[PDB]
């Protein structure tokens, strides 16, 4: 299980499920038919968001990693 | 760790200020210390003396003599006294019947 | 008065007001903040006879997001984190006063650490026998929630039939107020009334009737540990509590038409060290996973500009009586002892 | 003592050293040079060079402390100072325009003056004359009456007559009553003054 | 040629405790468990209690090797405080000196 | 309060390092402590106490 893993893996995780469901409600609000899992993950923004969660869970948590994680969530949620 | 976080009790922070306030140069130096051993109040005193000694290189000779006359460059020799075999404490005696 | 700003309307504050105190009126203080304000800030309001709050960047940054917030997308979680005594609680109040003026629905949990400790009457629930109720703690909140949102309690109406008992039930199409009044009068169905309030507000918000603000201070309690114990002296988990189980549903971003603003707090926390202030440490793995994705907002200590205006608000109210306080050398000691920390500075100035 | 007799007590006064050499008198100037040769003790933790240092409020804190718990003794003192401060602000906003000029809001000025209103002038000392002890009136020294004022205030508050009142609320209430020359601590001074003036016939038993 | 009879009794005690050490160990092992049946453990409770009393190690006393003193004995030197000090006060015990601090 | 993977892994480590494999309580682990040490009476400080 996940409690046994000694190293966090983003794939098939709560973070990937939460951000994936969040991005599907955003498409329905915009009335768009772009509802493909592979396409969403491919985007660069997701790559930066999954690099920040894997650094907070594994590496030491500092104020520099909470600000890098914040910028990656402001691009996915269009929070300019 | 920031000193206010490391030292919650105000008294400890007052000891840190003392050297700089005396030489009227607060907010002019950056200090990076590492204290080990002792307790809350023993660590501040040890830092005060270290900062004071290292702050004598950035002050005039006359100011260093004032620090000495203020008791900021002297090592307090007061340490715990041992207990004696026939007494309750270092100097306290068992009740005289 | 260089420390006060004449603009007492929080929808027009900007970067040019940073460092200046604005005035929260008595009418808004009682209505908007019955239970929110810190306990030691109400002594200042009671002694100064005025609630003046500083405009800082944490709240200005967070007010700029709630103005450009799309009410069609799912609610966005905003988290305020910082070192102890840095103003995150007060910054949150700044946003509750911005949204209350704009006819938002304020769901304000002033301190969530109180629901997981020191509970004397911990009744077993009747709607679900695996959960515990907290009648004294849910009925204190309903009275304040009613005060803030008294107007909407009649416009908002329930869409289901909630059975309190065989004799007494609330029928579809009543005002929500009846639910609240039921929980304040009986002080035993209150815990169930709170659950109904959260469910109705969350569902109706999506429809578009009203904008909802979920203001939860001390949000790391929900996914931590408790000091409550069963009759057999066994530790109780936080999700067994019916009041704490229904409040986790509002934090999830499965609804639109509102924003979620929360604030961490180690003061009042359980089994957390004093110097722990980061989100993961306080929230934990369970808390971080639930909140994620969330926007963390840092609250820091007073900067040089903000520090001088705090001391000019205390000097303008004659609250620094010692004759060396106003001098340049007295402020250097306040700055050093406190390291520009609002609470340490405010605690050191209370006895000068 | 782990210090030798050579070691002299330190002078924390910060405005003394700053004194210009031009003001230094011939006697004072000599002293300053002499101190250079002398060894100086390390300043204790209690007293610093801060502008808020008050020797009377530090001594009153040390006289309440129990078992070396100075964080709690100091905490009670500051809470008391804040309680006196908050109670006078509540008596100042509700007062008339001409009553606000006679309301002191500085808790220190209240603490020092209240203790000065409790200092007795003469005391009773038991003297052995003719195989009997007589409580003859004796002039208390300046220190003794300053110490008794503090001891009585702490004894009255510690006295277990107030069932469940916190020390800050008790000490603050007694300090405001002695500021207006009221209360038991002042009454305790009068009772010692009424017994020293009734037994003035035995004011010759003493020798010193 | 031991100091006294009290010492001589302990010598026998220690000799009889060395002969039955293994037998007692094997029988206690059965008793010190929750695995074996009570019927078997009850039979082992009677077998270890039928052995001579002097085989029991709780009867062994650490006396001095010179004066057979039961109390005031130092285990590292097997000597009484009186005999230890005598040799220590004369500088016969390597490393032993009087403490001052 | 252990996962099946962790519990079984612990059993595997107990077989390589020669520990107890079966689930045994604290009363029954004294048998391991009675046979893993030398008894007091067979120690050379006990039976060679006196000259
Ligand atoms: N007393 C009472 N409370 C009700 C009633 N219906 C709903 N509630 C309150 O509203 C809360 C939410 O109800 P519901 O949507 O059914 O959620 P739930 O029953 O808890 N199911 P789950 O916990 O799995 O999500 C319930 O926990 C209870 O607190 C009712 O008829 N009577
Ligand atoms: N914006 C502000 N305006 C006026 N006073 C402030 C402000 N921010 C902080 N303060 C001062 O700092 C004190 C503590 O602030 P606050 O209660 O918000 O701290 P906190 O971050 O919630 O700390 P904790 O983590 O302990 O809850 C307040 O009582 C107030 O006196
Ligand atoms: Mg002692
Ligand atoms: Mg707070
Ligand atoms: Mg037994």
Mind giving me the DSSP string for C117-137? S--S--PBPSS-TTSB--HHH
The residue of chain B nearest to residue D35, with distances taken between CA atoms, is: B69
Non-local CB neighbours of C165 within 8 Å, separated by 6+ positions? C189
Side-chain-side CA neighbours of C93 within 13 Å: the count stands at 27
**Residue spans of alpha helices (H) in E1-101:** 5-19, 21-31, 38-47, 81-89
Nearest to B4 by CA among C84, C36, C219: C84
Task: Determine whether the interchain pair C43/D78 forms a contact, defined as Cβ–Cβ distance below 8 Å.
Answer: no
List of residues 6+ apart from C250 with CB closer than 8 A = C107, C198, C202, C214, C260
Quickly count: other Cβ atoms within 10 Å of residue F19's Cβ: 11
Q: Which of C270, C277, C276 is nearest to C224 (CA)?
A: C270
- A41 and A12 Cβ atoms separated by less than 8 Å: no
Contact C182, C170 (CB under 8 A): yes
The set of chains that have 3 or more CB pairs under 8 A with D is B, C
Crossing angle of the two packed helices C57-67 and C88-100, in degrees rounded to 10 = 30
Residue F5, C-beta contacts closer than 8 angstroms, at least 6 positions apart: A1, A4
Contact in structure between D48 and D12 (CB atoms under 8 Å): yes
Q: Which residues make Cβ contacts (< 8 Å) with residue D123, sequence separation at least 6?
A: D137, D138, D139, D140, D144, D145, D148, D192, D196
Q: Other CB atoms closer than 10 Å to residue F26's CB: what's the count?
A: 7
* Phi, psi dihedrals of residue C207, rounded to the nearest 5°: -60, -35
C78 CA distance to ligand 4 centroid (A)? 15
E99 falls within a domain: no
Q: Is residue E42 part of a domain?
A: yes
H helix count then E strand count, chain E: 4, 2
- Domain membership of residue E96 (yes or no) is no
Tell me how far the alpha carbon of residue B77 lies from the centroid of ligand 3, in angstroms. Answer: 20
Identify whether the C-beta of residue C106 lies closer than 8 Å to the C-beta of residue C114.
no
Report DSSP state, residue E94.
T
Domain-located, residue E14: yes
| Structure tokens that stand for C212 in this block | 């909802």
Beta bridge partners of E74: E79
Cβ-in-10-Å burial (0-12, 13-18, 19+) of A33 comes to exposed
CB contact (8 A) between residue C351 and residue D85: yes
Q: Measured between alpha carbons, how far is E17 from B14 in angstroms, rounded to an integer?
A: 68
Nearest CA in chain B to D34: B69
Q: Does E97 reside within a domain? A: no
Task: Give the other-Cβ count within 10 Å of E63's Cβ.
Answer: 23
Number of neighbouring beta carbons within 10 Å of residue A34: 10
Structure tokens at C24: 């929260």
Confirm if C53 and C20 have CB atoms less than 8 A apart.
no
Specify whether the CB–CB gap between F39 and E55 falls below 8 A.
no
User: Is C284's Cβ below 8 Å from some Cβ in A?
Assistant: no
Q: How far is CA E91 from CA C172, E87, E95, in A?
A: 101, 6, 9
> Angle C249-C250-C256 (CA atoms, 0-180°, nearest 5)?
120
Q: For residue B77, give the nearest of D3, D36, D49 by CB distance.
A: D3
DSSP designation for C116 = G
Domain span including residue E8: 1-91
Q: Residue with structure tokens 């304020």?
A: C106
DSSP C115: G
- Whether B18 and B48 have beta carbons less than 8 Å apart is answered as yes
Q: Is C164 in the pocket of ligand 1 (CB under 6 A)?
A: yes
| Calpha distance B53→B75 (Å, rounded) | 11
- The closest alpha carbon to C299, from C334, C273, C261, belongs to C261
Residues whose beta carbons lie less than 5 angstroms from ion ligand 3: B 89
C263 forms beta bridges with C80, C217
Round to whole Å and give the CA distance between D39 and D43. 12
* Whole-number Cα distances in Å, C311 to B21, C334, D84: 20, 10, 21
Looking at CA atoms only, how far is residue A57 from chain F in angstroms? 21
The answer to whether A16 touches A10, Cβ cutoff 8 Å, is yes
Residue C260 near residue C212 (C-beta atoms within 8 A):
no
CA distance C40 to C267: 13
Q: Number of H helices and number of E strands within chain F?
A: 3, 0
CA distance C33 to D168: 29
Both tokens of residue B55?
């702050």
- The structure tokens 């006819």 sit at C103
How many domains are contained in chain E?
Answer: 1
Strands D122-129 and D132-139: antiparallel
Q: Whose CA is nearest to atom 9 of ligand 2?
A: C87
State which residue of chain E sits closest to F37, comparing Cα positions. Answer: E25
**Residue C89 marked in a binding site:** yes
For residues A7, A12, A14 and A18, what is the CA-based torsion angle, rounded to 10 degrees?
140
Candidates C62, C99, C66, C67; CA nearest to C79 is C62
Helices (H), chain C: 26-32, 42-48, 57-67, 88-100, 135-148, 152-155, 176-186, 190-207, 242-246, 248-251, 279-291, 304-316, 328-338, 342-348
Query: Rounded to the nearest 5 degrees, what angle is found at the Cα of C302, between the Cα atoms of C316 and D50?
Result: 70
Regarding the beta carbon of C111 and ligand 2, being less than 6 Å apart is answered: no
Which position has the token pair 């507000």?
Answer: C201
Two structure tokens written together for D136: 């003859």
Core vs surface per residue D82-96: b (16+ CB within 10 A) or e: bbbbbbbbeeeeeee
Whether C321 and chain D come into contact, CB under 8 Å, resolves to: yes
- Which pair of tokens denotes residue C182? 């039921």
Smallest CA-to-CA distance from D45 within D62, D63, D28, D33 is with D62
The backbone region for D145, taken as left when phi is positive above 0, alpha when psi lies in -120 to 50, beta otherwise, is: alpha
Q: From the CB of residue A5, how many other CB atoms can be counted at a distance below 10 Å?
A: 8
Among candidates C77, C194, C181, C78, which has minimal Cα distance to C127? C194
Return d(Cα C343, Cα C346) in angstroms, integer. 5
Annotation-wise, does C331 bind a ligand?
no
Beta bridge pairs of residue E80 = E73
Map residue E71 onto helix, strand or coil: coil
Q: Which of A26, A61, A74 sits opposite C280 (nearest CB)?
A: A61
- D45 closest CB neighbour out of B17, B45, B68: B45
Q: CB of C267 closer than 6 A to ligand 2? A: yes
Dihedral class, residue C101 (left if φ above 0, else alpha if ψ from -120 to 50, else beta): alpha
Q: Quick one: how far is CA C263 from the chain centroid?
A: 7
Cα C53 from Cα C99, distance rounded (Å): 16
Identify how the structure was determined: cryo-EM
Residue F27 alpha carbon to ligand 5 centre in Å: 10
φ, ψ for residue A7 (rounded to 5)?
A: -145, 125
Beta-bridge partners for C214 = C107, C260
Residues C352 and D84 sit within 8 Å (Cβ to Cβ): no
**Minimum-distance CB partner of C49 among D82, D93, D108:** D93
Angle, CA of B61, B62 and B64, to the nearest 5°: 65
Cα angle at C247 between C246 and C253, to 5 degrees? 105
**Phi and psi for D37 in degrees, rounded to 5?**
-65, -35
**What residues of chain A have any CB closer than 8 angstroms to a CB in chain C?**
14-15, 18-19, 22, 25-26, 29-30, 49, 53, 56, 61, 63, 66-67, 69-70, 73-74, 76-80
Neighbors of chain B by Cβ distance (3+ pairs < 8 Å): C, D
Structure tokens belonging to residue B93: 């005696």
Q: Which of C65, C44, C110, C106 is nearest to C263 (CA)?
A: C110
SS3 F8: helix
Q: Would you say residue E69 lies in a domain?
A: yes
The answer to whether C256 and C128 have CB atoms below 8 angstroms apart is no
Give burial (CB, 10 Å; 0-12/13-18/19+) of C299.
Answer: buried
Who contacts D116 (Cβ-Cβ below 8 Å, separation ≥6)?
D149
B/e letters for C172-207, b = 16+ CB within 10 Å, e = fewer, are eeebbbbbbebbbeeebbbbbbbbbbbbbbbebbbe
Contact predicate E46/E54, CB 8 Å = no
Distance CA E99, CA E91 (A): 14
Does the beta-carbon distance from C83 to B5 stay under 8 Å?
A: yes
What is the atom index within ligand 1 of the atom nearest the CA of C161?
31
- Resolution of the determined structure in angstroms stands at 3.0
Q: Which atom of ligand 2 is nearest to the CA of C313?
A: 4
Sign of the C-alpha dihedral, residues E54, E55, E61, E62? positive
Q: Containing H/E element for D168?
A: helix D167-179
Question: What are the start-end ranges of the H helices in chain F?
Answer: 4-16, 30-35, 44-47
Q: How far is the CA of F19 from the centre of ligand 5 (A)?
A: 25
E67 and E11 Cβ atoms separated by less than 8 Å: no
Buried b / exposed e along E26-43 (16+ C-beta atoms within 10 A): ebbbbebbeeeeeeeeee
Cis peptide before C293 (omega within 30 of 0): yes
**How far is C-alpha D168 from the geometric centre of its chain's CA atoms?**
17
Q: Classify residue E100: in a domain, yes or no.
A: no
The full length of chain E comes to 101
* Bridge partner list, C261: C78, C215
Residue C258: CB within 6 Å of ligand 2? no
Q: State the greatest distance between any 2 C-alpha atoms of chain C, in Å, as a whole number.
A: 72
Task: Give CA–CA dist F45/F39, Å, rounded.
Answer: 11
In a domain, E101, yes or no: no
Q: How many CA atoms lie within 13 A of C124 on its CB side?
A: 5
**Mutation choice for F interface testing from E6, E7, E13, E25 by most F CBs within 10 A:** E25
- Counting Cα atoms < 13 Å in the Cβ hemisphere of D171 gives 30
């Amino acid at each position: 299980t996940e409690a046994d893993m000694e190293e966090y893996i983003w794939e098939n995780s709560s973070s990937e499920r939460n951000i994936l469901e969040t991005l599907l409600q955003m498409k329905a609000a915009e009335k768009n038919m772009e509802i493909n899992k592979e396409e969403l993950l491919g985007t660069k923004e997701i790559e930066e968001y999954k690099k920040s969660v894997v650094s907070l869970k594994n590496e030491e948590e500092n104020e520099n990693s909470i600000s890098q994680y914040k910028e990656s969530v402001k691009r996915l949620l269009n929070v300019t | 760790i920031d000193y206010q976080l490391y030292f919650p009790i105000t008294q400890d922070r007052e000891q840190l200020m003392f050297p700089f306030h005396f030489v009227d140069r607060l907010g002019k130096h950056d200090v990076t210390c590492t204290v080990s051993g002792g307790g809350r109040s023993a660590q501040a005193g040890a830092i005060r003396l270290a900062m004071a000694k290292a702050l004598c290189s950035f002050v005039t000779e006359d100011e260093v003599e004032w620090m000495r006359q203020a008791g900021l460059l002297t090592t307090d020799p007061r340490v715990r006294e041992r207990k004696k075999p026939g007494q309750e404490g270092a100097r306290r005696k068992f009740t005289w019947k | 008065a260089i420390s006060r700003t004449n603009e007492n309307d929080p929808a027009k504050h900007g970067d040019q007001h940073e460092g200046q105190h604005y005035n929260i009126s008595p009418q808004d203080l009682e209505t908007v903040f019955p239970h929110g304000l810190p306990p030691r800030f109400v002594m200042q309001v009671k002694t100064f006879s005025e609630a003046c709050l500083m405009v800082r960047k944490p709240a200005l940054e967070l007010l700029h997001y709630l103005k450009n917030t799309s009410f069609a997308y799912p609610a966005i979680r905003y988290l305020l984190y910082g070192e102890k005594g840095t103003g995150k609680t007060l910054s949150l109040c700044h946003v509750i006063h911005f949204c209350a003026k704009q006819d938002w629905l304020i769901l304000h949990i002033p301190d969530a650490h109180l629901w997981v400790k020191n509970c004397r009457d911990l009744l077993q629930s009747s709607y679900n026998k695996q959960r515990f109720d907290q009648p004294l703690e849910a009925s204190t909140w309903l009275k304040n929630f009613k005060t803030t949102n008294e107007r909407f309690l009649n416009q908002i109406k329930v869409q289901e039939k909630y059975v309190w008992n065989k004799r007494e039930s609330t029928e579809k199409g009543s005002p929500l107020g009846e639910v609240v009044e039921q929980g304040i009068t009986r002080v035993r169905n209150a815990t169930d009334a709170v659950g109904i309030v959260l469910k109705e507000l969350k569902r109706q918000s999506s429809l578009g009737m009203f904008h909802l603000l979920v203001a939860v201070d001390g949000i790391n309690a929900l996914w931590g540990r408790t000091t409550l114990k069963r009759e057999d002296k066994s530790p109780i988990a936080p999700e067994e509590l019916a009041l704490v189980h229904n409040l986790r549903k509002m934090m999830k971003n499965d609804w639109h038409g509102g924003a979620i603003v929360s604030a961490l707090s180690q003061t009042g926390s359980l089994f957390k060290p004093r110097k722990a202030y980061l989100p993961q440490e306080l929230l934990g793995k369970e808390g971080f996973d639930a909140l994620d994705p969330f926007i963390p907002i840092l609250v820091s200590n007073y900067n040089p500009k903000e520090f001088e205006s705090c001391i000019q608000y205390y000097l303008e109210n004659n609250w620094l009586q010692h004759e060396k306080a106003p001098t340049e050398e007295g402020k250097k000691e306040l700055l050093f002892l406190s390291n520009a920390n609002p609470s340490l500075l405010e605690r050191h100035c209370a006895y000068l | 003592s782990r210090y030798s007799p050579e070691f002299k007590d330190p002078l924390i006064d910060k405005e003394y050293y700053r004194k210009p050499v031009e003001e230094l008198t011939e006697e004072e100037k000599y002293v300053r040079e002499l101190k250079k040769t002398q060894l100086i003790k390390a300043a204790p933790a209690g007293k610093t060079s801060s502008v808020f240092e008050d020797p009377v409020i530090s001594k009153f804190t040390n006289m309440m402390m129990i078992g070396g718990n100075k964080v709690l003794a100091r905490s009670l003192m500051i809470q008391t100072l804040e309680a006196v401060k908050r109670k006078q602000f509540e008596k100042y906003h509700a007062a008339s325009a001409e009553e606000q000029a006679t309301i002191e809001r500085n808790p220190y000025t209240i603490f020092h003056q209240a203790l000065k209103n409790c200092e007795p002038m003469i005391g009773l000392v038991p003297i052995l004359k003719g195989g009997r002890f007589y409580q003859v009136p004796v002039p208390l020294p300046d220190r003794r009456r300053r110490f008794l004022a503090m001891k009585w205030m702490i004894t009255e508050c510690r006295d277990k007559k107030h069932q469940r009142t916190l020390m800050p609320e008790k000490l603050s209430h007694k300090l405001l009553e002695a500021f207006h020359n009221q209360g038991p601590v002042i009454k305790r001074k009068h009772d010692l003054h009424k017994m020293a003036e009734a037994n003035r016939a035995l004011a010759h038993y003493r020798w010193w | 040629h031991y100091v006294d009879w009290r010492m001589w009794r302990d010598v026998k005690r220690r000799k009889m405790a060395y002969e039955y050490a293994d037998e007692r160990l094997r029988i206690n092992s059965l008793r010190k468990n929750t695995i074996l049946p009570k019927i078997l453990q009850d039979v082992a409770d009677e077998e270890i209690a039928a052995l001579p009393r002097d085989s029991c190690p709780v009867r062994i006393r650490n006396r001095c090797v010179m004066t057979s003193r039961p109390r005031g004995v130092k285990r590292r030197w097997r000597l009484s405080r009186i005999v230890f000090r005598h040799l220590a006060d004369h500088g016969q015990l390597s490393g032993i000196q009087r403490a001052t601090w | 309060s252990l996962s099946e993977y962790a519990f079984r892994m612990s059993r595997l480590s107990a077989r390589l390092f020669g520990e107890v494999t079966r689930p045994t309580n604290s009363k029954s682990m004294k048998v391991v402590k009675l046979f893993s040490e030398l008894p007091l009476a067979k120690k050379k400080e006990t039976y060679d106490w006196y000259p």
